[PDB]
Amino acid sequence: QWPAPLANGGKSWASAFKKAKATVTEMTVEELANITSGVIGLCSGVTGAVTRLGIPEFCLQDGPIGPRGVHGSSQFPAGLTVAATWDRTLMYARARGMGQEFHDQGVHLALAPVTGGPLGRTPLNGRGWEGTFADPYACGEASYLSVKGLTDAGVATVSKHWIAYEQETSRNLYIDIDGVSQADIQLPISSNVDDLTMHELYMWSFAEAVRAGTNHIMCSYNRINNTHSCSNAKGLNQLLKTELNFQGGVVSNWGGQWDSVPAAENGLDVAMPGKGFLGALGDFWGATLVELINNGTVSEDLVRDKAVRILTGYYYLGQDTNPPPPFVYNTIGAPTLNATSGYRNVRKPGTAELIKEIGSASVTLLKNTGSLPLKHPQRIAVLGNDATYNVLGPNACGLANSACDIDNLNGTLTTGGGSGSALSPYTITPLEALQKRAIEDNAEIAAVVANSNTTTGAEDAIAALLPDADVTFVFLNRYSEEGADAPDFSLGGDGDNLMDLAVTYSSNVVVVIHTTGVVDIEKWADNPNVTAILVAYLPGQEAGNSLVPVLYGDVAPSGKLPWTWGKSIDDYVPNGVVYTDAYSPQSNFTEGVFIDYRWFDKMGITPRYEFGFGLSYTTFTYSNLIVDHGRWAKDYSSVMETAEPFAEWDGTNSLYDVIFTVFATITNTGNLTGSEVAQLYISIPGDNQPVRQLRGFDKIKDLPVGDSAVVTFPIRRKDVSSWSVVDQLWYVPNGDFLISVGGSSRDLPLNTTWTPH
Template sequence: MARLSSISLLGLLYYGNIVAATASSNYTDYLLSSGTVKLGEWQSAYDKASALVETLTTEEKLTIITGGSAGNFTALEMLDSSTNPYTYYYVTTWPAGLAMAMTWNQTGIHDQGQALGSEFRGKGINLAYAPTLQPLGRSAWGGRQGETYGPDSYLNGHMGGQFVKGMADAGVIPSAKHFILNEQETNRQGSTSGGGGMGGPPGSSNSSTTTATTSTLPYNSVADDKTFHETYLAPFYDAVKSGIGGAMCSMNRINGTYACENQVTLGKYLKAELGFPGIVHPDVGGQHNGIESANAGEDFGSSMYWSNSTLGVGLTNGSFTEARLNDMVIRNMMGFYRYSQDASYPAYVSPTADVDVRGDHPAVARARGAESIALLKNTNNALPLKSKRSVSIFGYHAAPRYLGPNTALSVNTGTASTMIGHMTQVGGSAMGSLAYETTPFQVFTNRAASDGFMLRWWLNDSVVTTTSGMSGAGTVLTETTIGVADNSDVCICFLNAWSGEGGDRSELTNADQDNLVNTVADNCNNTIVVINTTGPRLVDQWISHENVTGVLYAGPLGMESGNAIDDVLFGAVNPSGRLIHTIAKNESDYDPGTAISENETIDFTEGNYIDYKYFDKYNITPRYEFGYGLSYTSFAYGTNISIQADTAALQQEYATGQIAIGGKEDLWNIVANVTATVTNTGNITGADVPQLYVTFPDAADQPIRQLRGFQKVSVAPSATETVTFTLRRRDLSYWDVVAQNWAVAKGQYTFYLAASSRDMKASTTLTL
């Protein structure tokens, strides 16, 4: 196999920032025909695609790379998203990415990927724009956090990787997005962008609703080489290793060059360093030219840019090569052959066709939704709800929207930060295609009928204190917020925070909703708060109120949302969700440098210190930390944890393996196992999520602690279960910017068994 040239222009770097390569750079190292990448299980697909390409004319090749059919190859059908087959009838709308990540269940998200993949397959869709790995969540105010797997690159990569494996097992081509450094919606398309509300700490220039952006170009992301590799590129390692056959390049620029024509990020890093064998295709509006995008590494594009008058001319004047054109065509076919779509793949059907592919998936989606809900507060065992005779529910979020459920949900400048109605999905291209939607109002009504309690409701976020109905009659409801709360055994406030593709968040709280909670709690000594959100939603406006006895916190839960919430509220499901982002006490506690920016250039000066790593670095106490979540039972961790390590392998400083699918092969070698125990000390069965955090030697220049293992385990009362965290070489490596390689530092590693990023239970060390 050919090795990457150490002097290739693809590899040129400034010590800090990655360099945007030009179209004149040498890109031959990332051609599949170069032999740079050991293809392994993808070799047969390459052989089939290569054989077909040899039979095609230049015109036919241009047809394939612009989305057409040629030879005996039929154009791929492509569609969003990781929640559902977008816009289709008779499909399942699953919990959004944030919610699925909050399960911390790798088997569960694999199975979701496989079930969702079967629905794409049933509709005749070849390639799914899924999973969404980025935006990672650099900014607490980012609008698209609801559809991704969180700001920790390890958790993001593991959950996204398992989703990829599941979808691939269904025979559908997974295509990860958005590549790369695409961390806000505002100004992602320049002055023509939908923009969105600006987010920022109170008092900052970004704390109010945005005005028109002044830039005429998409924002330009600038990140140093170490940050790029250790935080933003890391999840894509998992996705490539797990089997993605596609990657969507983003709309933003990177170091001055559009992401879809950036030869360093697409050629050097994605295709050569990670060994990605598939198709790079642009986000909507992501392609801007012909020769430059083709030479940079984009493989699928518009005939407006790629035709005989552009690429065809390039073939004759030497600015484009036949080898690169063949590589583009082959990459368009790699996933098709890798996942045997040439053998009896279902025919494409239109979105409204009466083809029902759901099977038992709604029931599974309900279970995953319930599993994702995090219990944040539970004073005096207020939850689960039992033996209640009078129940009152509050908030727009308890009931359906005025229209729906399968309606377009666009996000742009001025869009409200809360949804008037039950929020079950994010906005934009990951919105749900809902055949129906269950809401808390619906399930509480059914429960009142079956269980015999008295149900009252206030389906509004506003507080009304003036009496407009009869009062003093004893049985007539006073038409005020207080009147609905009066004499209730339990009052439940339903809150949401909504956002999505097209706009960032203008606030992390909401004055109307928070006033509602405080008013209800002032008049009801057993007030429960249920939150569904698309990103961090602060709670300090009422969390310390003595009458707020319970808090449930979740992402968008999809079509079975109401049922999933009911399952946890009433104890059919013991909550086991864990936070995937930090909930601060104040907006100003988040890094102001990561606030949504209208600047043309966004400099990632915070480096690897985002979310809990930032809070740890500056010793900021969160309200609820990353990884946090309670249960209706209790758990105790063993005080002794053990580690078995392959010290001989770890003494080798740099990764030396051959480049294969997922990068250098030895990065994936198992080098250590950490073993611990967890005991259920309560009286009901529950699932816990023991977590492993690692502190690196100083030479590695890493955050104080970072997640390097997690395992979801169900434990019966009084039982003890053993958990084992498996560490790969890459989990104990850092990116050496001088050597341009992954390295293992010498010194002491400390391994912490933990219940969250701030709750360490036991530790052990390893010295190299």
């Protein structure tokens, strides 16, 4: 129903496309099928070579915190954790660092970053942590910078997952072992998404990935309107490849492809894993595609366009003239692949300190009745296995960080489970960072780290230790992983119990939370014995040494929440995860654009901590809001260009031009130096519009007491537009826009009204 436009190279890949075209033009049918389907190798996936032309096997490798399965590398903080920095410089630098390590391990294509699938419709999503903000605008800037940093290191990106992949449950990878297939049991969950919602929420971050020059995009496991993502013509050929003007390849999820012919006709470029994983995740092209070309049902012109999309990245990143080194680790594992591993160390100086700065910039202060910052306390108590090592080793949970037992004390939660985890060379534990600082103050320190419910004597030891401590730290965690959603907000392990004991025996409890998402702390958050509360997300290998300096006030906290923290799972979008045994499971996105905070705002629900909330050790006062209509500029800077239709198109201009700039002033009005994330929210007029939508942020660094700084927010045409289902285009409405500036999504003291002319 929607025809596949041919690739032409767009803006920045013109010469790379031309080499890709000339190379493909000399290929046999048997060669075209080789490069478009996966083969057996050491990496997550591997394209077939075209050996007659000197095109090698491309190594495709997970994942969104760095190369997975690999020794000799670093464990970076997750996307969640960089999001909470609200710092553009760090978002870029992390991706550049990941890229360096991908390149040096010999990866051609990184299966990274996550750029808005999952976006955040449900805060229970098992792999929400792999992405960044539950907000299209901020997820969009984060995705732009993440793709830029990876591509600038010389690795091709595969941005994922396209699209509306918002729950793990019933995602239902294609699996066929013993002749019984997943198709005989249950189809994938189907996101039924209206067109306005697709344009204004889910496509937004992908447009940014495309503009930043993402080389490839991964389709998703879910169906959309009862059509598989990997063979959805409206999705791939029309929305992605026509409207977003995407010039790269679509890569299948591993078990994302369910058929041979529709996938070919409808926009898929690469079948993965192909012959990897014994063929059990389907092997629908390869020789079957040769047959389909030669027997006439799939055209050779169509398949050539797939190969050109694959080769465009190869030539634009200069992998022909500067090939990556060889890839030496078996990341698949026996019995699936029998193959020894080499060894390579790629950790560069500077990487560890970068990982620590992202942790120190993201730790988010939620409550502080005056216990923080610490001074030089003499007697410190520490609770929870989250304060120390996994008792079986940092990497004991295996190549996907998901094979340890349900009750294992996994230690500090530095990453989540699944394809987006990575190995850690060590873990810097909160306990050891705390002890180091205790020794400097000549203090004492003791930690109870066992399970408080099941270890003989643990409850007594807690009761004897806590009453004489000046401060007691409670470390809590909540592991989640790809493949399942969290059943609710409950804390992991014995957390509930550690809290019940902590508040019973101590009056100065400081809680620290390592987590993949929102958790339930309602029983304790208003207890006056809990004097402070911090969420550190998934900080990677520098867990303790990033946190402790914030606790002791060497650096004031400046992280803010990148999603909403509701009091109950009941306060979020209804039917966040659908559980059914129907053969055709359905998820209807009837909420439309109202997910996360925009659902809270429209329903008049008050969260415990709102989107964009974080405390500091000082306070900031906002003043002098200026809307400068004189400060406009053409968009010149993008790597690639969309073909997104809009009403004000004149043949030269762009949906992404800056049409005006907004300024405000902040003043440090407390007693310490501190950083501040300023945020700008826009109320677009129209019917059934979000109360307010984030459209800017700007983080001021280390503003001294009594000093002032100007904060600046460039507003693009698209930032102030709506999508017209009837006209099929973006337009700026006439009407009153409200513009608000402040320190969180509910704390906005500056406001003004803009009416277009």
